[PDB]
Design a protein around this ligand. Sequence first.
Ligand SMILES: O=C(O)c1ccc(-c2ccc(-c3nnc([C@@H]4O[C@H](CO)[C@@H](O)[C@H](O)[C@H]4O)[nH]3)cc2)cc1
Ligand SMILES: O=C(O)c1ccc(-c2ccc(-c3nnc([C@@H]4O[C@H](CO)[C@@H](O)[C@H](O)[C@H]4O)[nH]3)cc2)cc1
Ligand SMILES: O=c1[nH]cnc2c1ncn2[C@@H]1O[C@H](COP(=O)(O)O)[C@@H](O)[C@H]1O
Ligand SMILES: O=c1[nH]cnc2c1ncn2[C@@H]1O[C@H](COP(=O)(O)O)[C@@H](O)[C@H]1O
Ligand SMILES: *Cc1c(COP(=O)(O)O)cnc(C)c1O
Ligand SMILES: *Cc1c(COP(=O)(O)O)cnc(C)c1O
Lengths: 810, 810
Amino acid sequence: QISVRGLAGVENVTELKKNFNRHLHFTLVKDRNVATPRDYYFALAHTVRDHLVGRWIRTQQHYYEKDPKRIYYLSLEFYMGRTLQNTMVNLALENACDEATYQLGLDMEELEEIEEDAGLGNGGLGRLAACFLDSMATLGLAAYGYGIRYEFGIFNQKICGGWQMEEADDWLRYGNPWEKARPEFTLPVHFYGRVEHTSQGAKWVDTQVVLAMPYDTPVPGYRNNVVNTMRLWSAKAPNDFNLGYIQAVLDRNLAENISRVLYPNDNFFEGKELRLKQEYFVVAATLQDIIRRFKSSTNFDAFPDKVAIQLNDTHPSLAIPELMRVLVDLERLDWDKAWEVTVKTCAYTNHTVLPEALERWPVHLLETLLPRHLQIIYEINQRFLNRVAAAFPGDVDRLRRMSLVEEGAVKRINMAHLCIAGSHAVNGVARIHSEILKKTIFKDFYELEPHKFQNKTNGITPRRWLVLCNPGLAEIIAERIGEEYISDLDQLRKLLSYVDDEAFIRDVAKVKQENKLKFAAYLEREYKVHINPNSLFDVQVKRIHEYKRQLLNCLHVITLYNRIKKEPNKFVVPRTVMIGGKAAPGYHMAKMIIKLITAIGDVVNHDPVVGDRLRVIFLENYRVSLAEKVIPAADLSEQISTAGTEASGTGNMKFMLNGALTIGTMDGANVEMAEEAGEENFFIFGMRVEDVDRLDQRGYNAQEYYDRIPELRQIIEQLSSGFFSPKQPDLFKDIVNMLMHHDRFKVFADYEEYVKCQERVSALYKNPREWTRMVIRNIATSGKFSSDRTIAQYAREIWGVEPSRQRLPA
Amino acid sequence: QISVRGLAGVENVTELKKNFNRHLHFTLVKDRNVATPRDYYFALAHTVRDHLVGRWIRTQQHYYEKDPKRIYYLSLEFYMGRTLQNTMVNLALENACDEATYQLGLDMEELEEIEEDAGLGNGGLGRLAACFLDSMATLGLAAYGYGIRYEFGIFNQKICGGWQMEEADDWLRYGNPWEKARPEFTLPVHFYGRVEHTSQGAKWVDTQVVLAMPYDTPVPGYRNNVVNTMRLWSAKAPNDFNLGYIQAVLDRNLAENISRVLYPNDNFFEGKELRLKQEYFVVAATLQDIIRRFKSSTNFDAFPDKVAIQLNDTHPSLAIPELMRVLVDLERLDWDKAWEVTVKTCAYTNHTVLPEALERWPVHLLETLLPRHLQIIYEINQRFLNRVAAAFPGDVDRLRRMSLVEEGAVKRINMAHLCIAGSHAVNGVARIHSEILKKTIFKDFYELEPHKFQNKTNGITPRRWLVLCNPGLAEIIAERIGEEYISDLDQLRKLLSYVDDEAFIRDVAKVKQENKLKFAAYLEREYKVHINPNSLFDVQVKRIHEYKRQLLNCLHVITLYNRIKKEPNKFVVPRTVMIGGKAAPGYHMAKMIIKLITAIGDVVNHDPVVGDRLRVIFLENYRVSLAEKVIPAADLSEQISTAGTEASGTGNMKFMLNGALTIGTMDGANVEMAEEAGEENFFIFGMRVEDVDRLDQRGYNAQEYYDRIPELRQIIEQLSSGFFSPKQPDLFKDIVNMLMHHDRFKVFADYEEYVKCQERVSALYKNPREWTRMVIRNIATSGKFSSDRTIAQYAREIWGVEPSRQRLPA
Ligand SMILES: O=C(O)c1ccc(-c2ccc(-c3nnc([C@@H]4O[C@H](CO)[C@@H](O)[C@H](O)[C@H]4O)[nH]3)cc2)cc1
Ligand SMILES: O=C(O)c1ccc(-c2ccc(-c3nnc([C@@H]4O[C@H](CO)[C@@H](O)[C@H](O)[C@H]4O)[nH]3)cc2)cc1
Ligand SMILES: O=c1[nH]cnc2c1ncn2[C@@H]1O[C@H](COP(=O)(O)O)[C@@H](O)[C@H]1O
Ligand SMILES: O=c1[nH]cnc2c1ncn2[C@@H]1O[C@H](COP(=O)(O)O)[C@@H](O)[C@H]1O
Ligand SMILES: *Cc1c(COP(=O)(O)O)cnc(C)c1O
Ligand SMILES: *Cc1c(COP(=O)(O)O)cnc(C)c1O
């Protein structure tokens, strides 16, 4: 139908149809008279999977023969979403499958909606890992993603009475056709025990064994016939486990609980024992796999030439002492040689500066669970602090600040400090964040080893986040500049030549309008909600957190409501304000914010005087597959975190690529996005980082803003008095109290500038031609934010390998 | 190679080879350079499974169109064993697959050994269910087996220091290619709650829900293109279950524990709550499935014309009050109509008279777990006892004896009494057992309703238990009388014409000798044990229980040892004595017996004076796949239970079919086997049932036998003094104490007759020609013991359906 979806040749369509019917009969054991849409989805998924496997086997064979340097990306999270459509796009099968299914009397889009998201992540960090796997395959790198196969991913969110309720995400209920169990490659992982010192070094004995069973998922590159592997470990009890009889069998569940559920915290360190077990489990199993593959090509001098290990935050930081343990205790290398190998192999990416998000494990936990690792950590610390003392003699305070061991009521290990000491490269995820690392929290480390510190600005894959979710936009771009931009996003710069082209302006605006109609229809069908598709679609979708300032958006929404009630008969630009995202189950304030948003909607959406001029919608169960629907429909992207708190953001980049304008602070990657597009093509407001610092030095007093801004005072009075909660007048007192007395993120300090900037947005939206020209300037300069660019920089500057766009044979 | 294994035509062999390679590549995702034997097994299993599915779909379609009466066989156990070879035999693919795998450079027998047993049963009762499913499919009945998909089946037995150790039977570790998950047909099962009485009858409310997810396995008939279904339920938590957050997800394990593990008791009622939950779970899910299928063709008058439910012992007895509950509470039938329907639908098979094996559930358990069912049971009981009172006025003791409710310290429900009251037919499993039921434990019920009581003598499938496990014997029979006997075992009677045929005598003896060499080699390879293949193979394999009298075999073994030591230089017929079987983990005496057997072996097998004249071997991990190896190698079958205790036996029949002579008591089916073959062709000894009764009336005094039999006294002194346990002199004092003072099974009372009868066995074994002629007379008269005969009798006399040998189209 459209050119970017590939060819639908007669023989291909014919062969897909016969294999579809073969899988329906032989694989699913169904005849056509009793098959449901779910059966048809599975028949298609198996048909498409067959096209992967030849390429998957050939790719892994190629790597075994050529023996390139191997990249191991270790993460506790991979937020993959759905696989069917992505696979078709990357194999150029989308039009052929569409045609083949059409001829069988089926609508492929309907079948795509049946697939469960693989929701094995919380948000941005997990989704970055997914985009990176896509870019690594597309750039022909011999890369492996290693993680945990959680039985239950991020919870499904239901809203009941305006409150979030959590239910289990039973994503494997109907099976996962994309994975292949590899029980033959099962490996032991040890816990507890104690350390014996013999004449032949240390020995970790009396341990409890849990088995790690791998499941492999294929990761196809974009049209290059490369298929890499994501390997996810599942926990299994050994067969002699506890072996009255019946209870011993039932107690196998305790070992297997390790891979049961994803901890649903975003930017918050909770620190449960079960979580520590997850971290070690992934590290221990992965390192054995790495070493096995290295031996099948004992001289570990070449280890760093054949292996790179990238640590996605500190969550797999135990890789450092585990590698030391294996090399010293099992392979009998001397300490110094082992340390040299470890440092050259490992690299660490930091994703946050929020103090509450940093992992600091109590010593007593490590002592009980991983006593050998704690000994190795103490040794690392003492040798590291010996270097600090020689570089900065007499600076005793520096020694305390840089220690891996944190003193206090409870002694803790600072895992970030461990990662820095044991890695040859430490990077932040956006220029401003990387600078903040060097000036604030890692300042001491930067002064000792300036050469370690780098920036690698985040990106997103243009396959999922343009071609897949927004085919109409992809097509009109392709009509002008061809298809090469899909694996070379800098080519979007050519679109600047069409900024005064009337046909292109019309086409960009038409695609957006189609995306909005399609999303407005989706809302009516699945959720019984009616929205005006001519209104400005004002969208904030991301995890619910105080730093992201969903509350500042709420204040603006109530301001617009109060202005309408004050002057009912004045024209205002109609808006649909959409906010979506999950709160961690333990995060009370985040749950209260969700309730506030739905409470505002209850008043605004049923006021007859407002009409369809203002609607507030809480988008339920925000996840990767919902992002693919709402982002292409957005006009305005809300990226309004307090300057200094969002390390990068990636949602911001998704909206830029899909034809929304951005309102935001100079935070994270927003800064680089404005630099690429021009500040005149961005709605920037609020305090810069330096302004936040000056306000902290003087002391943030929220009362001052309350006293000087009548419109803000009115809102706080409405909240306190029960205007938005008539049956429970004091329902929002914790929100009011926080805003007035304990606001770490300075919501009131940015209120005035935000409202004024929002007025400029509305003024531009009244002139569609100029709105659309500004959009073209954003899309055209979004090329820097391809994850292909990000990964090429990791490859050359950290991993020491050269990317490639060359195709393997088909 | 051999004719009974079917044809290996060029096109079939070619097509199997290509599909084998297709599955290796596409299904297993392996190339040939890294494939292991396990991969090759799976590639073959998937190749063979493909041939089932067309037939499976067509059969189930045929049943939906014709709408025959449906037979539902409910069991807590299905002891299936391996499926690959059985499937090839029933589809006539064995030679073609052998040839196809040979051409690919693979040995099919080697690949068959990789398959795990489906060990979802304890012993005879579970294996009977498996044989019955095979015969039902072979006789073209529209039959469904319904049970539980246990995650862990009967434990794997290891012997360590001569003691049994249990380990978990993780049979699903590598996957099960034979099953198909059907999560689309998942059904709710309720527990706990309470009963509300409204004006609209009773209502069961406030319950906890567990989901039942079905897994379907194909059951092929013998060369008739019929493929029936075994449906096994797996337990799943609902998604709102317990919905802090993390613990609620982990607590899903409590619901799913229902289908976790088989209770490993044989002929012993343990009565744990988790076991009661298993019983209700299978019943509740199955009955909803039955009713759904009945509605898709509300007038329940025709229900018994379209449905038969057979209860495999009392384990699914809750089917009776569950059916009443559904018909009265949900469908709103009046009680009397519902009861009429229930009685005509249900039939009950009893498998034991041992008091400790009968299920008697405490009222408090039922009251808490299934309060509505307990109310229905009380109502059933009161109406039933009203009938007894009208038939036998004034007989108050009869009322107490026949009650469903048993009085005492704890009130209990007698489930056998429930089954009799709620079934139109009650059968025993061998003529002597069925008579015992009418004269002893169910005497009162027989006097009230004589028409209910039947016999259906057990049988075994000649597909698994001759063609599959003993191809050499099957072939030499087929050479003389053709192949028709495989589905018409009465045709073995024609072999009586060859009893004086010298070629046939030679061939029968040669097949046995080949089976013995092959088993002696198997022992050396897998277990490092060396046996003389010219010795008489004396075999007792069955679950370890006091009633089966493995201890009487032990006494004979020690008698032979002591006789050899007394007269070293006298000729005796060499024997290899093989005893195998599992003890329930809680059954202390059974575990002690295993230790005694290995202790006897430790003395006997290392005495230089004995030489290879006597060996005692404990066969480890006895299970269906080991039965298939050892039974064809046996010369002597030990079936030596105390008369009145083995309801039927089926191992006895397996040995008869495979060319062993039998030494046994007149117990269970042994009686009918001797009747068919002629008593002159059986080694019968010991007390009859009537002799046991006379001895019980007088009082069993074991001391009398000790005082009068010097050889028996010597053995007891050896046991007591520590001859068989030198480092632990009193190790066997519990065995000695039981034998002397508390022996319920009268081991000493049969000792003398047993030893004398064993001497007659040895005398016959010295004359190979006459031994072999007696064997031919046994094989030739074994036709009655086909499960095809058994099932035809259930069909005509209980279920009211006509069997058929007609083929469906291919
Ligand atoms: O249960 C636990 O103990 C536990 C659970 C989860 C976590 C956890 C999870 C995620 C994060 C986290 N830190 N930064 C992130 C996000 O990473 C994205 C990709 O670089 C950035 O674009 C975002 O700006 C940043 O906020 N996520 C931080 C901590 C920590 C502990
Ligand atoms: O855990 C529990 O509560 C529990 C577990 C298991 C059982 C249970 C299991 C099996 C049996 C049982 N009763 N007879 C049997 C056997 O059934 C065979 C087929 O008809 C006969 O050939 C045998 O002669 C007979 O011993 N098995 C009886 C009870 C009962 C309770
Ligand atoms: O010994 C070998 N011979 C041939 N190919 C091998 C061997 N070892 C690994 N390979 C290839 O490389 C892959 C190994 O996967 P891995 O062991 O997970 O790295 C296989 O799919 C093979 O194609
Ligand atoms: O509504 C129907 N139309 C056509 N075939 C049906 C229908 N319902 C059941 N069947 C057939 O009977 C089988 C039903 O399996 P069951 O529901 O487990 O008894 C299916 O495999 C179909 O072939
Ligand atoms: C991109 C994405 C995120 C990250 O969004 P931010 O605005 O950068 O926090 C979170 N969740 C989902 C489902 C995403 O697709
Ligand atoms: C046949 C069989 C049984 C029953 O044997 P009995 O001698 O009748 O108790 C038990 N277990 C297995 C594995 C069998 O094949």
